[PDB]
Design a protein around this ligand. Sequence first.
Ligand SMILES: COc1cc(COc2cc(C(=O)O)ccc2-c2nn(C(=O)c3c(Cl)cccc3C(F)(F)F)c3ccc(Cl)cc23)cc(OC)c1
Ligand SMILES: COc1cc(COc2cc(C(=O)O)ccc2-c2nn(C(=O)c3c(Cl)cccc3C(F)(F)F)c3ccc(Cl)cc23)cc(OC)c1
Lengths: 255, 256
Amino acid sequence: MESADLRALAKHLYDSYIKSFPLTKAKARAILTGKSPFVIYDMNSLMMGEDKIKFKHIEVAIRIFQGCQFRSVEAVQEITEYAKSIPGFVNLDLNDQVTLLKYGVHEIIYTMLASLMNKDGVLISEGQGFMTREFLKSLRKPFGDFMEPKFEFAVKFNALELDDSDLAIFIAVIILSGDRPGLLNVKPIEDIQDNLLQALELQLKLNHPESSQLFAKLLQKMTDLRQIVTEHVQLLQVIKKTETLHPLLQEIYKD
Amino acid sequence: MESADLRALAKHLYDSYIKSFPLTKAKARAILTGKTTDKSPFVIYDMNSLMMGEDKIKEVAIRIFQGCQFRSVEAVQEITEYAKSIPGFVNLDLNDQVTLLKYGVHEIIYTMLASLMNKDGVLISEGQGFMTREFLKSLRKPFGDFMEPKFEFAVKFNALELDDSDLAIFIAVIILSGDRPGLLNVKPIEDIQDNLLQALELQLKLNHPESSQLFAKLLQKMTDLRQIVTEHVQLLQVIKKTETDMLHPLLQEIYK
Ligand SMILES: COc1cc(COc2cc(C(=O)O)ccc2-c2nn(C(=O)c3c(Cl)cccc3C(F)(F)F)c3ccc(Cl)cc23)cc(OC)c1
Ligand SMILES: COc1cc(COc2cc(C(=O)O)ccc2-c2nn(C(=O)c3c(Cl)cccc3C(F)(F)F)c3ccc(Cl)cc23)cc(OC)c1
């Protein structure tokens, strides 16, 4: 509705995003730009890194892969809590709430991973570690090709130069997608997303006055996310199908 | 912890329990206590009705036993999804997550099995069926003694008259037990349980105001289940020594 109302909606989402996510993009950027993390750049520094920082995840490539999984499962919970703060979400049909989270979390994880990345690597363990891109890119069998597309996405995504207040609204828009399979009541979902989209458009105008058609460009990225997530789940399928784990542990990571 | 925060924890757990478990106690009671033309189960009380039931919905004792196992495996899956929603669980050491599930799932299954039960039998196939206590109690060799202790517990547990919003918190409390064998970091688990216990205590006072010392009574039940689970695995052990030709990989790993 009114501009005052969209601004209030943007502020509400920002305040909630700050409480929901441990490491903001602003904090990550301060770290990546040297403005201090333990650096993992090869096999020996990896072994020291587990010695040094307290990894809760514990072949080298598998351990790293298991580390991605562990953090993603935490991210899913963090995003799930975030969604409850999106005005109207908790009033949706419970099955639709589940459906929106089920298909949304992977796109949001990918999006938010870009905040922890630059062209040279990725922050881990709330910023205590930094794993270099070239070291990840050089892992064996399929694992190297599993890590690198995330960086290829993140470098393009980061050229938009979004900040946390932009991302708080963007994340909400992805959750409130009325085309997820199996939704029971599309209408209030699109009505919410319509509101979030108005708030994002106003947010990008005020926060990036010089950035022409940034709204449109961000929407284009949101579409990309669908196919890159689909290729991700396909690679996830094969790595799980070949490189075997306890049944209880496998059940934790089934989703 | 502040009341508003404990109430918020109760709503989060209740909402997540509804999302993770397809047949709630509220639905089970609606089916069992009827009033219904649409929710009424087909009743299995003997061999003939069993054979008709398969039409409607490998000695009987084995078929029934494998039917439990399949369902118990699904329950494990449901319980694992539930646990991931308990605030703080997925942030624990991965080995401890596995350990909490390994020792927790059986106690929760029995707990939730009570919801599908009355003194006369148990709902099956998401409530389409109802198998009588006496028919199970009469199965052969050890299988007859295998079903009956579930009923003995359930009759005592159901007298507490808990509803699903209570059970959601109770179930979480069970998972977050810092005394499971082999845990590496007891303290953060105990810290989660402290909050869950505070939340259970407020939930039970508000939701059962006239039910004196229900918190204490509910905790006493949580201890029993530990031995009731032991009697189950001790029975299970013998079946393995007897029925050499028969467990799901998930159930196999949970045991030992
Ligand atoms: C402790 O040890 C570590 C820790 C990490 C940290 O990673 C991440 C951190 C965050 C965060 O904090 O917000 C978010 C996503 C990742 C990550 N996920 N991932 C997947 O594959 C993935 C994705 Cl995108 C989406 C859904 C599911 C999955 C998964 F389930 F299948 F995992 C990555 C692949 C490559 C990279 Cl570089 C990062 C991620 C990374 C690490 O090694 C690189 C080791
Ligand atoms: C479709 O066909 C059916 C279906 C059932 C349905 O049962 C159950 C349903 C549920 C549920 O839906 O949440 C939960 C537990 C049981 C059940 N398990 N069980 C075991 O023994 C057992 C247990 Cl507890 C734990 C681990 C492993 C096992 C097992 F692997 F070793 F089995 C029971 C023993 C007696 C009773 Cl009465 C119920 C259960 C029951 C049925 O016959 C009774 C036939």
